[PDB]
């Protein structure tokens, strides 16, 4: 890297987010409250009433066919059965906001592109960037400006789903016959009248294909929104990936697909009894509205891993039944760290220090406060199924086809693994493939099914050691990890503003055995909140001690 683009970009981003916080703070608050109100309204209305209304509207819009309405009823009742109603409402919120803004900013922009051969070339590369550039890279600055919640999900979905609307709008406005345009000019048609009477109706096919594309993309871009606090089915997908459970993942995905098809049909019915029909539709909407019309705190950020889920749920209950109103939000790792650093979040209890989150602690650390370990007994290292003869790293010869399995690049586990592959000699010629945690877990599960040898870069506590039978490998050289500790983290300035929760978080502590017990309780089927209630009933004195 002879040219320092990395440093230039990092410095520019720090400066800009240091200068442009106020207005963005007010708008993030405004949009968050607006979107929360929308979702609350949509969730208040019972699911049966909304299902009936949507199938009614499908009947009105379809006519004498019964495919789309029956599909609507079937799918939505299925979802209400699977318990994914509120998530569906939140997903509807963000998806409609993204699609509306995307269409509104695309169709005018596509027209501008079509009426100016300059703007087309001035915008095409921008669309390429917006549509192809990974959303992760400007995810972190997006969180810096707009903070956690629905707003950055909306922004990302918008700037990923606008390009297709724009491009196909440009084509449709450009692919119309020039003879008709001459005819419309000869009759004194301003560009507006020619655009509303000739251009748009003839381009509706391409424009509506672009709109369908936009909707599908914005629905795909939910997980990239749900890893930064946006509720919905994206949280379910992420929790299924972590659990390596294709059942829940497929359920959430198929719910998203059902919503996509519903919206797509209700939208394509806009390309090309009437008064009765319309009055019935208005009555249905009015009935929806009628049905809808029927202290210390702390905001925490945590990750979609079973360990931190258990920890945070236990903490939340201990707070609630001792006079609190908590707001726990499930994020990604780096997003959570940034949120705590910027002061948006009041802290996190998920700092697997000093070997797992070392990059995050090093980059941050000057803008947070380390409150110390909250659980000791956590370990990191190589992991192999319990059924294999191997029992120490020094004995690895040709297993796993001389191929280690990673977790994700840059994670301290992978750096320690690279160090291990250079410290030793038996596995100097081994490899290290960086993947995601979900891929590692799925490969492990399949290998256990097929009884085949596998070596992974894992940690405890985790569901692997409970769902499957594994074993750690010995590390005499200690290059990999030494019983790292989970540590609590807070934002710089909680001791002065909300000390009543700083006491709790600094005094918070509980053992890994309890965490494994709670995870075991969950995996059998109990919800995390019930598990927290149970373990707090069994371990009440410690809870009272933390306060």
């Amino acid at each position: 890297g002879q040219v320092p683009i990395a440093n230039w970009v990092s410095s520019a981003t720090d400066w800009i987010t240091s200068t442009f916080s106020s207005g963005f703070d007010v708008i993030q608050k405004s949009g968050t409250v607006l979107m929360n109100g929308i979702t609350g309204a949509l969730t208040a209305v019972p699911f049966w009433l909304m299902i009936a209304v949507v199938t009614i509207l499908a009947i009105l819009v379809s006519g004498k066919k019964i495919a789309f309405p029956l599909f609507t009823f079937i799918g939505l009742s299925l979802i209400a059965n699977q318990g994914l109603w509120s998530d569906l409402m939140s997903t509807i919120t963000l998806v409609l906001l993204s699609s509306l803004l995307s269409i509104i900013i695309g169709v005018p922009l596509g027209i501008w592109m079509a009426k100016s051969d300059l703007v087309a070339k001035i915008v095409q590369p921008i669309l390429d960037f917006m549509q192809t550039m990974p959303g992760f890279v400007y995810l972190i600055p997006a969180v810096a400006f707009f903070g956690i919640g629905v707003v950055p999900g909306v922004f990302a979905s918008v700037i990923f789903a606008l390009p297709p609307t724009v491009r196909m709008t440009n084509l449709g406005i450009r692919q119309v016959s020039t003879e008709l345009v001459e005819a419309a000019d000869s009759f004194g048609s301003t560009a507006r009248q020619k655009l509303f009477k000739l251009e748009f109706p003839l381009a509706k096919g391409t424009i509506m294909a672009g709109v369908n594309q936009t909707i599908m993309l914005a629905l795909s871009m939910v997980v990239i929104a749900s890893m930064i606090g946006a509720p919905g089915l994206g949280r379910g997908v992420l929790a299924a990936v972590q659990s390596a459970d294709i059942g829940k993942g497929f359920v959430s995905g198929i719910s998203l697909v059902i919503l996509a098809i519903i919206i797509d049909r209700f939208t394509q019915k806009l390309n090309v009894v009437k008064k009765w029909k319309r009055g019935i539709a208005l009555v249905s909407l009015l009935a929806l509205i009628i049905g809808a019309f029927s202290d210390k705190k702390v905001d925490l950020v945590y990750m979609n891993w079973d360990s931190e889920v258990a920890s945070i749920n236990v903490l939340t209950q201990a707070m609630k039944e001792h006079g609190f109103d908590v707001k726990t939000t499930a994020l990604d790792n780096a997003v959570a760290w940034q949120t705590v650093a910027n002061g948006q979040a009041d802290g996190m209890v998920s700092a697997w220090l000093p070997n797992t989150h070392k990059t995050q602690w090093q980059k941050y650390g000057k803008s947070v406060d380390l409150l110390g370990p909250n659980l000791k007994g956590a370990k990191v290292g190589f992991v192999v199924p319990s059924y294999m003869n191997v029992n120490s790293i020094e004995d690895l010869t040709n297993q796993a086809n001389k191929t280690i399995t990673g977790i994700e690049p840059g994670a301290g586990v992978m750096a320690a693994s690279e160090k291990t592959l250079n410290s030793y000699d038996n596995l100097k010629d081994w490899k290290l493939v960086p993947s995601s945690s979900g891929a590692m877990t799925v490969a492990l599960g399949e290998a256990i099914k097929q009884h085949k040898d596998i070596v992974i870069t894992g940690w405890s506590p985790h569901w692997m050691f409970n769902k499957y039978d594994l074993k750690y490998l010995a590390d005499p050289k200690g290059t990999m990890g030494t019983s790292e500790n989970i540590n609590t983290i807070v934002r710089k300035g909680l001791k002065k503003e909300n000390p009543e929760a700083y006491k709790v978080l600094d005094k918070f502590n509980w053992t890994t055995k309890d965490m494994e017990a709670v995870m075991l309780d969950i995996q059998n089927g109990k919800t995390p909140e019930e598990a927290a209630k149970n373990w707090i009933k069994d371990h009440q004195k410690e809870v009272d001690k933390w306060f």
Binding site: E179, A183, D185, S186, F187, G188, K197
Partner: protein, 260 residues
């Protein structure tokens, strides 16, 4: 006097410079196309059209008639020359005045009928009135009256794809007439009409001019109609005028086997 045209010229393609030089010498159109690929649409067309006059234009297919009509309405700009409409060079008109001109002064009828598929006959026929912000009521009825004059009032609810060539031609004609402008540019509006309906439309035009002293430019290939209605006739070849007489052409002519 209503319209002037002075050294009007429009040359398509590219290499326009050498092609214009060639015509300045007086070389034919095909040789110019062979060397350069620039087809001289029309060259040094200069004449005058008075008010209340059916200036019929006639000539071989490939002689520059539709191009002249388009230039008059400034749907395309010439490479050299001036078009004056009421002592007003259309090329020096800001968009608003051009728009008023295109709405009230002159309306055009095309060879290909310039029809909107997504709109019924009653919605294409009143397009020239919608843009003028005319109410629904009066424009609706004017369109209906025009269609009845064109014998299409039973098809007012149909779409062009549900229609033939002649009915679509009459739709374009009616759309031009319904606007009731001061100038009617017409590019072979009778090519796809039977003699009876053709003569109905000719009588329509003659009535319009007799009552409303209204300028009409009427491209045609039919000798019979040009003589019946044409108060003045202009004949074209290879992009240039050859005579602009009314009825003397049949008596005196420079090698115009074009006429009987």
């Amino acid at each position: 006097v209503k319209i002037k045209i002075e050294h009007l010229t429009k040359i398509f393609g590219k290499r326009i410079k050498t092609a214009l030089t060639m015509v300045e010498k007086g070389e034919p159109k095909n040789e110019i196309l062979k060397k350069t690929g620039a087809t001289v649409g029309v060259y040094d067309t200069n004449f005058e059209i008075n008010e209340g006059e059916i200036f019929v234009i006639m000539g071989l297919s490939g002689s520059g008639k539709s191009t002249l009509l388009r230039l008059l309405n400034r749907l395309i700009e010439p490479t050299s020359g001036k078009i004056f409409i009421d002592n007003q060079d259309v090329a020096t008109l800001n968009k608003e005045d051009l728009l008023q001109v295109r709405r009230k002064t002159m309306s055009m009828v095309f060879q290909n009928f310039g029809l909107f598929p997504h709109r019924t006959i009653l919605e294409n026929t009143e397009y020239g009135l919608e843009v003028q912000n005319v109410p629904k009521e009066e424009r609706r009825k004017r369109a209906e009256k025009a269609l009845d004059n064109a014998n299409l009032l039973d098809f007012k609810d149909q779409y062009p794809k549900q229609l033939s060539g002649g009915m679509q031609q009459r739709v374009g004609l009616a759309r031009a007439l319904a606007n009731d402008p001061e100038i009617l540019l017409m590019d072979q509006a009778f090519s796809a009409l039977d003699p009876l309906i053709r003569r109905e439309m000719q009588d329509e035009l003659l009535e319009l001019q007799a009552k409303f002293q209204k300028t009409i430019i009427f491209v045609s290939h039919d000798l019979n109609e040009a003589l019946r209605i044409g108060d003045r006739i202009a004949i074209m070849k290879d992009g240039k005028i050859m005579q602009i007489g009314t009825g003397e052409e049949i008596l005196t002519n420079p090698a115009n086997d074009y006429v009987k």
